Design a binder for this molecule. Structure first.
Ligand code: CLA
Ligand code: CLA
Ligand code: CLA
Ligand code: CLA
Ligand code: CLA
Ligand SMILES: CCCCCCCCCCCCCCCCCC(=O)OC[C@H](CO[C@@H]1O[C@H](CO)[C@H](O)[C@H](O)[C@H]1O)OC(=O)CCCCCCCCCCCCCCCCC
Ligand SMILES: CCCCCCCCCCCCCCCCCC(=O)OC[C@H](CO[C@@H]1O[C@H](CO)[C@H](O)[C@H](O)[C@H]1O)OC(=O)CCCCCCCCCCCCCCCCC
Ligand SMILES: CCCCCCCCCCCCCCCC(=O)OC[C@H](COP(=O)(O)OC[C@@H](O)CO)OC(=O)CCCCCCCCCCCCCCC
Ligand code: KC2
Ligand SMILES: CC1=C(C#C/C(C)=C/C=C/C(C)=C/C=C/C=C(C)/C=C/C=C(\C)C#CC2=C(C)C[C@@H](O)CC2(C)C)C(C)(C)C[C@H](O)C1
Ligand SMILES: CC1=C(C#C/C(C)=C/C=C/C(C)=C/C=C/C=C(C)/C=C/C=C(\C)C#CC2=C(C)C[C@@H](O)CC2(C)C)C(C)(C)C[C@H](O)C1
Lengths: 194, 161, 174, 154, 181, 42
């Protein structure tokens, strides 16, 4: 009845090894306060966004759409250079996708009202790649793992672009170590301001 | 420009406001040596003052005879960032707070002791409600038309007259 | 049941000897991922296009149609493509193959419905597949030659990138 | 009780519809799995979406190459916009809206092609590696692995 | 052969300084106790067995390559394009610079991607009953009882010795600055 | 954590003080990084 991830803690309730990627890792007991269905929806959503984002950073470094507005190797510069109209078009399209794909059940109070609704399962299988039920368990597992890995990787890429103003693989190929004089962490109250 | 006002970037009194504000700081800086903490602090203030005046000059604000920026709130779109757009942001947040608090009060009515839920708040349920407020205009209007926002006049206690 | 082509691996559980060109070769389990009728139609399509591509490379090295040498000179393989995009040649090919592919889309969707064999456009103007055994021999042959030409086309175009020559003059020189 | 973020409207005293449609399993190529009307997936299923996308991709090819192509003295073709054609009967409107108004590639400088990318405005593909290796480099190229070797020998 | 009871088999401890653990099972080829830190308690035994055989085969092939390239022996024209030196490290660096090492990397990676990972996944899931390290690669006969009794033991021991010896050679060459033979 | 101590932290004065201290803190931080926002910049 101990956790498998954290052997010295007890196994958290609402974690029973049914879900893919369920290794018993819930030390702060978020699952005891927040329903595990909402948490798995949020984990799958974050992970999918990050999977695309990590691939976005790498591909944006290599391949570009034509034009000077899309010639930003460093991804943090692409945010500012890419046309505002089209970026807000992306944002509005995301909002329409969120309301329709969730079928107007978006709030914490109303989502999962239908007992048929499954965490992360929006009905998205355009090419019916999940039609085979033999592959279902390992697909669910590898989707969860790809999402977790990509959350960590995109977090690293964004803050390494902040520290080193270089695109990620160009940072790997033209590497420069931290001086430590720059990018001081904290310090707003030690010097009493300014 | 509008109402006989002058854009702050070319009003000379805005320029005198900036110059007097910087001389006031520089005469305080004249009593300190270069690398000291009071000298560094006052130089940071001088840079902040100059930045604020420069930004206001290029923002489309309209200074008066006094040289202080004035706000136009009659509804014209060239000045919507001074009242109409901050107002839209406010009404979204205020309606969020109202919708979320109303949802918790209706949940707390269906509790074992309804008055214990309001001095000892159910924090997971209340956080569930605080997250729902992002689509309050649609949720509240659908609540209205479904006859669940407004209660009829004969379920409301009134005074004898 | 172990794979006949890869003996230490299991039989790929979606491939059967009634298919053409079957050798039990699906080590990555892709026949379980995608629908198998789609994969068969994609394989035959890739096969026929690459057979045409390989023969076109060979023939283009041997001879060239009248007038073409003036418009495209020393250029060969991918190099002619850009020149012929400027003229209307490549666009016209795209248009007519795209027209055929609209009906091929309808045909593939009927195949996924299960009313048509993959690669079956019923096209046999001259008579070759009258007899059943010869039809089987041709079916195995056409997948085998198409696969060989898929790898061939790959090799030919990549050799063009490395040397700038193309298949026949690469045989003649080096 | 209510756990929090459970999502059931009856645990948060919220009015629900009470109607929860049965979830089917059939899918469409550019659509979603979900409750439809009877007969909907038979007329607007995968067959419809694939054929319609195929026809739209075929009809893109005249549209992306739209223009007034005219011959000179020789066979050389000049391309012009459809605006230059003048309709003769509509009063003060002399030039008329055409297929260039619904697909205005030229104003945004797109150079559209049937493949979707023309010579001008072609996709840009570059090399990140910058013509050097992973390890043991010399010059203006110093990799992460080279710094691992640099730190280990110091 | 197996020699159960005498060597390998079950109940055999090559270093009685460490008692043979009960976690360890007496049915893996070339298995003779020797589990001090108790890894067999919790690791998948088939996975670590396959890993041991695969590390053994790299070690043996690497030993053969180190000896040949340290004896000066070569294929025709290899020394013309690569270096004429016999230092294994420098040959690796210049064969990297020639693309030969990239080609070996490509084809070894392809073999793992399409065959190594499916063999691993099936052998660990429990769908194929493939013994660890088996790829049906026995062209020149030498099968039968000897292959699963003595030859299996030979592969595991010769490979463990090859691992120790190659680690030894690479460390000695680096500190001395001179190779073997 | 003890459920009675968590029930004490759920009392109205504690949540009121924490919520408005958090609210005050992100107004202070927003006016530190983005000071003198007299208008919505547009
Ligand atoms: C209502 C429909 C509509 C209309 C009329 C426009 C009109 C415009 N958009 Mg678009 N846009 C829309 C919807 C629309 N948008 C949606 C729904 C999104 C979100 C997915 C975007 C995202 C978007 C971006 C990111 C950009 C535009 C741009 C433009 C402008 C120039 C277009 C151009 O030159 O095309 C000719 C060019 C092409 C046809 C090139 C196409 C490039 C390929 C197809 C991109 C690949 C798409 C990718 C797979 C997306 C998948 C995600 C999606 C399924 C959610 C033009 C004002 C650009 C702009 O503002 O520049 C000034 C720009 O940068 N838009
Ligand atoms: C979230 C609960 C809530 C809601 C939805 C309303 C809604 C309303 N109030 Mg009431 N009110 C509330 C709390 C609430 N009030 C509290 C706590 C007090 C005590 C200070 C009052 C005192 C009060 C007075 C004196 C008046 C109103 C009036 C009004 C109306 C107009 C809006 C307004 O004037 O705001 C005014 C709001 C206030 C004066 C106080 C609001 C204080 C905070 C910001 C809201 C409460 C937050 C709450 C703790 C939410 C927790 C949520 C969490 C558990 C999830 C409207 C019917 C007016 C009216 O009748 O007009 C027709 C009026 O004159 N209210
Ligand atoms: C993947 C296939 C493919 C592609 C993309 C190209 C592309 C091209 N070829 Mg190559 N070519 C091909 C196959 C291909 N060819 C084949 C199969 C042959 C004959 C063995 C040739 C022989 C050839 C020569 C000799 C020349 C070209 C040239 C060209 C260029 C101009 C097009 C032209 O006029 O070609 C003309 C090509 C043909 C008329 C042959 C078309 C073959 C078709 C596909 C046979 C189909 C018949 C079959 C029974 C199907 C019936 C249809 C039915 C289903 C309805 C362009 C680069 C020219 C060029 O630029 O060279 C520098 C040129 O001079 N091609
Ligand atoms: C896309 C390929 C392509 C291109 C760019 C050309 C281009 C040209 N051809 Mg060729 N031609 C082609 C395909 C092509 N043709 C094919 C497939 C045939 C059918 C066998 C011909 C048959 C042909 C003949 C018979 C003649 C031309 C001629 C000409 C030239 C006209 C002057 C012109 C430069 C004429 C010319 O000047 O060639 C010497 C000529 O007499 N062409
Ligand atoms: C002494 C070494 C040795 C031994 C005893 C074995 C024994 C075995 N191997 Mg392994 N194997 C080895 C080396 C060895 N292998 C190496 C290095 C490789 C990589 C090339 C392989 C790759 C391999 C695969 C892929 C598979 C096996 C399998 C097997 C088993 C059946 C095959 C058989 O019996 O033929 C063995 C026959 C011989 C050992 C005859 C001797 C040939 C010698 C070793 C060649 C010497 C090369 C050269 C002259 C080097 C010396 C000079 C140098 C110093 C310069 C058996 C358990 C199969 C199995 O059942 O796995 C569990 C299987 O599928 N082996
Ligand atoms: C070209 C222009 C359009 C041509 C027409 C389109 C034809 C489409 C045919 C396939 C669709 C189909 O119905 O068959 C789908 C088939 C069968 O699927 C079946 O379709 C039937 C239609 O009658 C029914 O609808 C069934 O419900 C369904 O089971 O499934 C497959 O096996 C397809 C395998 C595809 C391979 C996947 C590889 C990855 C694809 C690219 C991924 C890019 C990701 C980036 C995108 C990011 C944003 C998400
Ligand atoms: C149907 C689809 C078929 C697809 C087939 C292709 C894909 C198949 C799968 C491929 C998977 C990847 C394989 C590699 C592909 C590229 C090959 C390549 O040339 O790479 C390219 C690069 C080298 O790039 C080289 O650059 C040189 C110039 O500098 C040469 O001139 C050539 O350009 C090139 O060979 O490869 C690497 O960087 C490999 C780095 C090392 C990788 C591991 C080596 C082996 C493991 C031992 C390492 C131990 C390290 C211990 C710790 C050390 C710490 C310092
Ligand atoms: C699941 C996601 C996990 C996220 C992990 C976070 C990783 C980065 C965290 C910091 C990294 C190292 C910090 C050293 C950097 C460091 O310690 O600098 C020190 C700084 C105070 O300055 P000093 O007094 O040290 O000045 C020292 C002199 O040397 C210089 O003048 O500490 C802070 O208060 C900064 C953090 C803000 C504190 C409030 C944060 C916002 C509160 C939001 C609610 C709580 C959230 C958690 C708060 C902790
Ligand atoms: C002649 C008029 C017409 C044209 C020119 C046309 C072209 C295309 C193209 C072309 C590029 C695509 C890609 C496409 C795809 C889809 N069409 Mg189709 N379509 C037309 C007519 C209708 C009707 C009347 C309906 C319909 C539907 C769907 C659904 C969703 C199914 C679902 O998700 O369950 C998808 C994906 C149904 C619907 O629900 O639309 C919201 C529905 O009733 N369509 N359609
Ligand atoms: C909703 C949500 C999710 C999510 C998400 C996220 C983060 C989604 C992000 C999606 C994105 C980034 C979509 C990007 C679309 C880009 C387009 C359409 C480009 C068009 C280019 C054009 C028109 C052009 C041009 C041209 C111009 C004008 C002039 C030329 O000089 C240049 C050029 C030739 C190129 C997911 C699915 C993960 C889960 C969950 O369900 C919740
Ligand atoms: C499901 C579905 C389908 C689909 C689909 C799609 C679009 C599938 C695409 C899936 C994708 C894009 C997965 C991407 C995963 C990325 C990962 C794991 C990156 C991790 C990075 C790491 C660990 C890192 C790092 C780094 C850091 C921090 C330090 C740096 O200095 C360097 C470094 C780079 C090393 C389709 C649409 C086909 C239909 C089908 O019917 C249903």
């Amino acid at each position: 009845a101990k956790s498998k991830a954290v052997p010295f803690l007890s196994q958290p309730e609402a974690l029973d090894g049914s879900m893919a990627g369920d290794v018993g890792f819930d030390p702060f007991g978020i699952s005891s306060v927040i329903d595990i269905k909402w948490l798995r929806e949020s984990e799958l959503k974050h992970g999918r966004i990050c999977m695309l984002a990590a691939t976005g950073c790498l591909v944006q470094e290599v391949v570009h759409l034509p034009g000077p507005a899309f010639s930003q190797k460093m991804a943090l510069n692409a945010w500012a250079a890419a046309p505002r109209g089209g970026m807000i078009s992306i944002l509005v399209a995301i909002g329409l996708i969120e309301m329709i794909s969730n079928r107007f059940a978006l709030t914490a109070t109303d989502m999962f009202a239908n007992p048929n609704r499954v965490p992360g399962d929006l009905g998205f299988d355009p090419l019916s790649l999940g039609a085979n039920p033999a592959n279902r368990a390992r697909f669910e597992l590898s989707e969860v793992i790809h999402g977790r890995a990509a959350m960590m990787g995109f977090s690293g890429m964004v803050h390494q672009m902040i520290v080193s103003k270089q695109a990620p693989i160009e940072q790997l190929m033209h590497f420069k170590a931290v001086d430590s004089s720059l990018m001081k962490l904290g310090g707003a109250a030690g010097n009493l301001g300014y | 420009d509008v109402a006989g006002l002058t854009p702050c970037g070319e009003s000379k009194e805005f320029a005198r406001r900036l110059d007097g504000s910087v001389k006031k700081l520089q005469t305080r800086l004249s009593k300190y040596e270069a690398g000291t903490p009071p000298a560094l602090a006052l130089q940071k203030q001088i840079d902040k003052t100059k930045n604020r005046f420069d930004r206001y000059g290029k923002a489309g604000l309209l200074c008066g005879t006094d040289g202080l920026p004035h706000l136009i709130t009659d509804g014209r779109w060239t000045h919507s960032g001074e009242f109409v757009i901050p107002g839209l942001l406010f009404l979204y947040v205020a309606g969020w707070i109202g919708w979320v608090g109303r949802s918790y009060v209706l949940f707390a009515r269906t509790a074992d002791k309804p008055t214990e839920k309001e001095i000892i708040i159910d924090v997971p349920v209340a956080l569930s409600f605080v997250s729902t407020g992002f689509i309050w205009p649609f949720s509240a209007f659908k609540e209205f038309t479904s006859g669940n926002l407004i209660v009829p006049a004969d379920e409301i206690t009134v005074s004898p007259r | 049941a172990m794979s006949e082509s890869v003996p230490f691996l299991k039989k790929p559980e979606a491939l059967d000897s009634s298919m053409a060109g079957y050798a039990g070769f699906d080590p990555l389990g892709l026949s379980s991922i995608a629908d198998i009728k789609f994969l068969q139609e994609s394989e035959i399509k890739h096969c026929r296009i690459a057979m045409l591509a390989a023969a076109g490379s060979i023939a283009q090295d041997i001879f060239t149609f009248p007038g073409v040498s003036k418009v495209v000179g020393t250029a060969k393989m991918t190099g002619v493509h850009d020149v012929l995009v400027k003229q209307g040649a490549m666009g016209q090919i795209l248009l007519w193959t795209s027209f055929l592919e609209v009906f091929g889309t309808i045909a593939l969707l009927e195949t996924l419905d299960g009313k048509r064999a993959p690669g079956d456009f019923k096209f046999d103007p001259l008579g070759f597949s009258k007899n059943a055994e010869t039809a089987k021999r041709y079916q195995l042959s056409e997948i085998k030659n198409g696969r060989l030409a898929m790898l061939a086309t790959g090799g030919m175009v990549h050799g063009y990138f490395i040397t700038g020559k193309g298949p026949l003059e690469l045989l003649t020189n080096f | 009780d209510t756990t929090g973020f459970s999502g059931v409207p009856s645990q948060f005293a919220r009015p629900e519809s009470g109607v929860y449609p049965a979830e089917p399993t059939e899918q469409t190529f550019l659509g979603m799995r979900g409750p439809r009307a009877p007969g909907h997936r038979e007329n607007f299923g995968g067959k419809h979406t694939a054929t319609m996308l195929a026809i739209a991709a075929l009809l893109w090819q005249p549209v992306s190459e739209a223009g007034m192509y005219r011959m000179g003295a020789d066979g050389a073709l000049t391309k012009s916009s459809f605006s230059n054609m003048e309709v003769p009967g509509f009063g003060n409107m002399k030039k008329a809206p055409t297929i260039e108004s619904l697909f205005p590639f030229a104003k945004n400088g797109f150079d559209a092609s049937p493949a979707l990318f023309g010579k001008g405005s072609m996709i840009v593909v570059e090399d990140p590696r910058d013509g050097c290796g992973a390890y043991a480099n010399s010059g203006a190229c110093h990799t992460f692995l080279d710094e691992i070797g640099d730190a280990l020998k110091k | 052969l197996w020699n159960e009871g005498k060597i390998q088999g079950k109940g055999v401890s090559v270093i009685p300084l460490f008692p043979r653990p009960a976690s360890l099972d007496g049915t893996f080829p070339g298995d003779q106790g020797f589990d001090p830190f108790g890894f067999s308690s919790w690791v998948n035994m088939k996975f670590v067995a396959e890993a041991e055989i695969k590390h053994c085969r790299l070690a043996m092939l690497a030993f053969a390559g180190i000896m040949v390239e340290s004896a000066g022996i070569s294929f025709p024209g290899a020394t013309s394009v690569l270096g004429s030196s016999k230092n294994i490290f420098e040959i690796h660096d210049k064969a990297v610079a020639s693309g030969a090492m990239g080609q070996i990397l490509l084809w070894v990676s392809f073999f793992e991607v399409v065959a190594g990972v499916p063999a691993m996944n099936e052998m660990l899931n429990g769908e194929s009953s493939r013994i660890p390290g088996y790829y049906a690669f026995d062209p020149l006969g030498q099968g039968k009882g000897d292959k699963m009794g003595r030859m299996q033991l030979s592969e595991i021991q010769n490979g463990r010795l090859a691992m120790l010896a190659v680690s030894g050679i690479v460390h000695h060459t680096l500190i001395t600055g001179k190779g073997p033979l | 954590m003890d459920s009675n101590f968590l029930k004490y932290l759920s009392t109205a004065p504690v949540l009121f003080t924490v919520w408005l201290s958090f609210t005050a803190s992100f107004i202070i931080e927003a006016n530190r990084f983005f000071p003198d926002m007299l208008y919505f910049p547009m």
